[PDB]
Structures are given as C-alpha cells and as structure tokens.
Design an enzyme around this catalytic site. Structure first.
Site, PDB file in Angstrom:
ATOM      1  N   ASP A  78       4.832  -6.412  -5.441  1.00 42.04           N
ATOM      2  CA  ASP A  78       4.038  -7.228  -4.625  1.00 42.04           C
ATOM      3  C   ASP A  78       3.571  -6.577  -3.603  1.00 42.04           C
ATOM      4  O   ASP A  78       4.166  -5.464  -3.181  1.00 42.04           O
ATOM      5  CB  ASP A  78       4.733  -8.448  -4.357  1.00 42.04           C
ATOM      6  N   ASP A  79       2.741  -6.897  -2.878  1.00 40.59           N
ATOM      7  CA  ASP A  79       2.146  -6.153  -1.644  1.00 40.59           C
ATOM      8  C   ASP A  79       2.945  -6.305  -0.429  1.00 40.59           C
ATOM      9  O   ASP A  79       3.534  -5.445   0.048  1.00 40.59           O
ATOM     10  CB  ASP A  79       0.819  -6.848  -1.323  1.00 40.59           C
ATOM     11  N   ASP A  82       8.954 -11.351   2.307  1.00 38.55           N
ATOM     12  CA  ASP A  82       9.159 -11.935   3.383  1.00 38.55           C
ATOM     13  C   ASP A  82      10.062 -13.288   3.015  1.00 38.55           C
ATOM     14  O   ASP A  82      10.094 -13.503   1.817  1.00 38.55           O
ATOM     15  CB  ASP A  82       8.094 -12.590   4.121  1.00 38.55           C
TER      16      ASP A  82
END
Ligand SMILES: [Mg+2]
Ligand SMILES: [Mg+2]
Ligand SMILES: [Mg+2]
Ligand SMILES: [Mg+2]
Lengths: 142, 142, 136, 136
Positions: A78-79, A82
């Site tokens: 994933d980029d 959080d």
C-alpha cells in the site's frame, strides 16, 4: 505540514524498498491494495522481475475484490499506513504475506513489516497521481 | 548516502526559502555564486519579483568576476554550504549581504544566514543540473 | 493548447545546444539575459565547464565588453534581441526557443515554435493538487 | 531517436483518456494488463473515481467475467490484444499509445506512434548522473 511526493521521488523510495526485498526468488507474487498501492506495486514488480501482480479492493469495511490465498510467498503493498485505515483487515486476510508500504505515520509503524519513509502524524501527504504541473503565481507580485 | 535532488524538489525548497525572504521590498537585488547558485538564484528572482540579478565567480582562490559593492540590500545565494568551500570569501567580499543557501552540511551552518535543508556531513548530494532521465536496468534480472 | 516546457525537456534542449557549441575551449564566458536566460545559461555553464558566468539586466546592470569570445543566451526570441545585438556586437547570440519573428535575430537556437505559440517555462510552474475529472 | 515518456507526460495522456470515458458511472471497474497497464490503470482509477481495479497476467492469473461494464487497459498496442479481445469480449479495450499494427485491435487509444518507434516508459528509467559534454 504538506508533504509533496513527486513521481521521481516515489520511484526512488520504491527502488530502495525493492532493494530490501531481494533476493527476488523468495517471492511468488505481489498483491497491491487499490488504489494507493497500484503504482508502488507496479514499480516493485518491475524491479523484482515479478509478473504475477494481483489486487485487493476494500472500500472502508467492504471487500469489493479480494486476491485469493493467505498471502504466503506474497508481498502486499500500500502507499501509506496509519491507524484507522485498512491495515488490520489486510493482516487478517493475508496473515502470511509480507506487508510493506512506502510511507508510514507513527501510529501505523507497528502495523506493517517494512516501509521506507517516516511521516509525522500531523503531516498531510500529497501523492503524485493527485497532482499535476500547472502555472503557479509568484509569491510576490513585485 | 547519496542524496538525489530532482528539479521539482529544488523548486519546492527554493519557494520555501523565498517565503522566508518576504517582504520582497527589503531587497534591491540578488548575487548568485556561480555555478551552483545560478538556478536557485533564478528561482528566487522569479518569486521575489527581482530583475537585478548579478553573479560572483570564484574558482578556488581566484575571483574571476565580482559583483560590485558590499552586498547591502542584496541577497547572496549558493546551492550548498560546507567548510573548505568559498563561504568565508563570500562573507568578506559582501559583509552586508544576506547569505543564504538551499542546503547546508553541519560544518557549514554557522557560515550562512539562512538555509532550507539539512544534509549530513557524510552525505553526497547530486544536483539536478548534473543528472538526466535515462534507462536504468532492474535490480533483479528475474 | 498551452505549450508546456518541463525541467526535463529544457535540460534536453540545453544539452543539444551545448554539443553544438563544442569545443568549449573557444569560449571565455557566458552572459545570461536576466531572467529568462539564467537557467539555460547555468545549464550551458555545466555542460561546457564554463565557470565565468555574467548577466545583463535590461539597462539596470550589464556585463563589460563587446561580447568577444562570449556566448550570450536567452530563453526565447520574439521581437531585447536588438539591444543585445548592439551591446555585444562580437558575441555569439543563442536562445533555446525561437518564434518566426525572432529567428534572424539570433546566431543559433534549438526549438522552432509558431508565432502564436503560448509557451510556459518551468520556473513559472509547479506541482499542485489537480481535482479528479470525476467526483465519483 | 529514443521516444522517451516521462511520468508527467504519461499523466497528461491518461487524463485525456479519462475525460473521453466520462461519465464514470457507466463503468463497473478496470482490468489492468500486467505489467504495462498497471500505471495507466491506476491513473484512470484516480481520475474516474473507480475503486474496483483488477488485473490479467498473461494466463498466470485473470480477472473473472467477460469484461461487461469494464475498461481493460494496457500501455501500448502492437501485434495479447487478441487474447484480451477473446477473454473479455464485452470489455472496452483501451491503450495509451498505439502503433499502426495495433490500431484496429483497441476500441480507443490516445497517442499514435510510428511502427519503428523505440519507446521507453518511465518505470524503466530514472534520474542518474550524466557526465558533462565537455571535460573542461
Ligand atoms: Mg492509501
Ligand atoms: Mg556549490
Ligand atoms: Mg525571456
Ligand atoms: Mg506493455
């Protein structure tokens, strides 16, 4: 702050992440988290020589599309990671995969196996696919 | 490490430096240290609305060309500052100027009035004018 | 319709011009026309290993001499080219781009652009958020 | 001679294609051809607000169905276009670039490039040190 990620920089971070994933032979494929992980996943696939690239799509929860398996021998990417996102869901669906992201905010660090750049919890990040090169007026109209 | 500075990033750092130099009215001109400070100087000139841009050329010491004056009301700019360079000479020639650089290594910090990015003493920096976009073989030949 | 020039493209053009100016040894220095010629000038300075770079700001400030042994550079040439021509009569005047009306005013240039061309240089632009086409 | 495609240019082309595919609502999802179509696919996904993105790897792996309501995308089309054509007979097949021989194989494309064109995509490139033209 506003953290701007340009195309060239994303590619630099991606190549650095790819280097940590060597030897390439330990991987069978890559599962990109849509849409954020698509570009980083394509860069990793190019660097590792991997052609088997699949996707996992999750509106927040609703699994629109899911790559089969438990992620063994796979890299899930994933980029950014959080708290409050889809990181926990990803780990449950593919408990055997190597979960990596390009960026990580403090609260997301313990949710991934590896990442490249640290981002302060308070920093907004602008990805290159959301931007464009346009005319910008000078700061001073002098 | 090898710190890569892309064109877009240099422009971002330059705009951030320009913002600290406001109000623009406090400046009469800009003196760029050749060749490193030429691009950053051109970016600052565009942002501050300044058209009076001059240069100071110094092979290491030999002043090939020198902008006249003591630097009062002027901004003197170079790309990077460190020890063993031309920072001391610049301060002697234009003691009244505001000396700024985009990058600064620890040893160069006390030699300038302001700068944008911190670079470790051991880090090699590649500026965009020294690079180009070319084919790069994949890390893995898989 | 906008003719956009990115940093990468400008750099490619400056290098084409540099290779045409070889051998570098034949040159004493470069005089960049402020402000447009500053970046193309810095690029030539790097490619040709020329450390002597001066500027002409028009006349708020001007480099000494008649341009003998010097390369004078600007970014674009339409219809200052004349002022330079008379200020540095012995200089090799070059630009990156040239519109039809400016072609005969320079000794050399790299790119030919139509007279109505609306060109945007990379120092006036930047990477900013652009709303998606669909709000879906 | 090399036809270089930068990230900025690819993005501009993908947005032109996106505006041609409006309204986004008419689409169920996008099937990207691996690996060339992955980036153009991600760009369309962003511009059209499409979250359902799948892939076809040829057949190591393939997205379900016959492509009904789907956009299938690849980066370039010369002479797989046929395999896709028969695998997803009901899909809207598009590419960013198209060489003469590939033109009739796709439903739409953005850029026309000559058959002998030597094209380099941005994922195969990178910013590296390039020696100056002069050693001066
Ligand atoms: Mg994301
Ligand atoms: Mg320097
Ligand atoms: Mg101009
Ligand atoms: Mg392809």
């Amino acid at each position: 702050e506003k953290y701007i990620v340009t195309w060239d920089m994303l590619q630099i971070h991606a190549r650095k992440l790819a280097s940590r994933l060597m030897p390439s032979e330990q991987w069978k494929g890559i599962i990109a988290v849509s849409r954020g992980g698509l570009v980083p996943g394509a860069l990793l696939a190019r660097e590792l020589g991997i052609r088997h690239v699949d996707t996992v799509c999750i509106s927040s929860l609703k699994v629109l599309k899911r790559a089969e398996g438990d992620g063994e021998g796979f890299i899930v990417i994933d980029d950014l990671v959080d708290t409050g996102g889809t990181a926990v869901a990803i780990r449950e669906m593919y408990p055997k995969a190597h979960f990596v992201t390009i960026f990580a905010k403090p609260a997301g660090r313990p949710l991934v196996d590896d990442y490249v750049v640290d981002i302060p919890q308070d920093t907004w990040i602008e990805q290159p696919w959301d931007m464009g090169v346009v005319f910008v007026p000078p700061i001073s109209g002098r």
